[PDB]
């Protein structure tokens, strides 16, 4: 039982690292989309609902 538990914990740490990387990439993508939506609104090609959704 100790064998299996320690192995599982190790794999879990690795999975956590990978998930963190994925989420950082997602955050950057969302920031870019929000900046685009805000600039469009500033120039007058988009409403404010889009800004709030972003």
């Amino acid at each position: 039982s100790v064998v299996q538990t320690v192995r599982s914990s190790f794999n879990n740490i690795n999975a956590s690292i990978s998930s963190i990387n994925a989420y950082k990439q997602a955050v950057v993508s969302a920031q870019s989309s929000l900046d685009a939506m805000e600039a469009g609104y500033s120039v007058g090609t988009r409403t404010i609902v889009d800004v709030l959704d972003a």
Binding site: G44, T45, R46, T47, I48
Partner: protein, 49 residues
């Protein structure tokens, strides 16, 4: 469409397009009216004889 823009609930390009559409329709009507007037220059509302 104007009232929505008054409250900022539509893009300003949508208002610009609608206003330009009104102006273009007015110009087309002017063309038609002047064409009709040109045709009426050859009659001057006189009898057939």
């Amino acid at each position: 469409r104007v009232p929505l823009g008054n409250a900022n609930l539509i893009g300003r390009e949508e208002l610009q397009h609608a206003r330009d559409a009104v102006t273009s329709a007015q110009a087309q009507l002017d063309v038609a009216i002047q064409q009709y007037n040109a045709n009426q220059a050859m009659i001057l509302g006189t009898k057939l004889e």
